[PDB]
Amino acid sequence: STGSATTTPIDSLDDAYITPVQIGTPAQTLNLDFDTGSSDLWVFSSETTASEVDGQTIYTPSKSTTAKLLSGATWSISYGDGSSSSGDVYTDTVSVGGLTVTGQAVESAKKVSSSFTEDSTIDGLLGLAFSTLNTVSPTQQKTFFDNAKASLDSPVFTADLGYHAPGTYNFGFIDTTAYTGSITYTAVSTKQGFWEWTSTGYAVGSGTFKSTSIDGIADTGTTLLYLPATVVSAYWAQVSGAKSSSSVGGYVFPCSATLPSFTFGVGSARIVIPGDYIDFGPISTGSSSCFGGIQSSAGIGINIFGDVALKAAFVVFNGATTPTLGFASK
């Protein structure tokens, strides 16, 4: 089997991407944030505290003839941005882009933090990191990908995120029409439960490539590119008037600037992030200070290849017995 679903930016900045997901019988379609940096499929629901719901579509398990309470199971998750959610668990039928899993753990939120409530466009998350990170207790649950894997034509999914445009998540196949050149594969460590890999270096604009190992994770659920402070300083030093602002919480730059590209290495291959991808617009409405898309990972304890980086590439998440990542230009 295979599945193919379109993923759509939630706003004009590509802050996140939503993908429609069918849950239950008859189907309830929710727009979920597919997150390769976490391993829980959780939704706004009929159980979510009413004051914490503001515009989201909810899953109502009582209206699904295939929903079953997973008795005694709870979940609770905290993300890198400080947000959180928790609740109880149902199993139900979940379909993505025509690919169906029966008996998927659907984590029903009883509580969500303010950042979730405030984002009316995201109805929940669908985690695509390794199932070792799933938070369900006392019986850890599998991701949608891990439950689908054995049925797929190939044990893979691909992320093809758009820049200010829709893109695609595919499950079970490589679309050889969706990228240019060849795919370069690179080793993955699953020791922290992430799609963790080592970039071979970077370049700023038309500058020389610096060969250096940068361990980090491929995380579709993180907006920005978070890299070591040395790398990030080297990038923003090429933008007149850019500075790190403790008040704003990262590098800002004049909105009048033209940003340089950023290149990262994948083995001997190179992915180029156009400068435009690195512009996250005014820090507040009407400001001439703009927020940068490349930020320091210092204090986060890991480098994160978030959407700024991933949307410059066609990315293969290879879930074979020995997982690997692939990157192609597009």
Given 45, 86, 131, 199, the catalytic residue:
199
From the candidates 14, 33, 35, 88, which is the catalytic residue?
35
Q: Distance between CA atoms of 268 and 232, rounded to whole angstroms?
A: 22
84 catalytic? Reply is no
Query: Cα–Cα distance between 329 and 126 in angstroms, integer?
Result: 25
End-to-end CA distance of the chain: 25
Which stretches does DSSP call E strand in 16-173?
Answer: 17-23, 28-35, 41-43, 68-78, 84-96, 99-112, 124-127, 156-160, 167-171
The question of whether 288 is a catalytic residue gets the answer: no
The β-bridge relationship of strands 99-112 and 41-43 is parallel
CA distance 47 to 88: 9
Give the contacts of 7 (CB within 8 A, at least 6 positions apart): 17, 18, 19, 34, 161, 162, 166, 167, 168, 169
Distance CA 191, CA 206 (A): 35
Distance between CA 171 and CA 181 in Å, rounded? 21
Spatial contact of 162 and 9, defined as CB atoms under 8 Å apart: yes
Which residues are the active-site residues? Answer: 35, 199
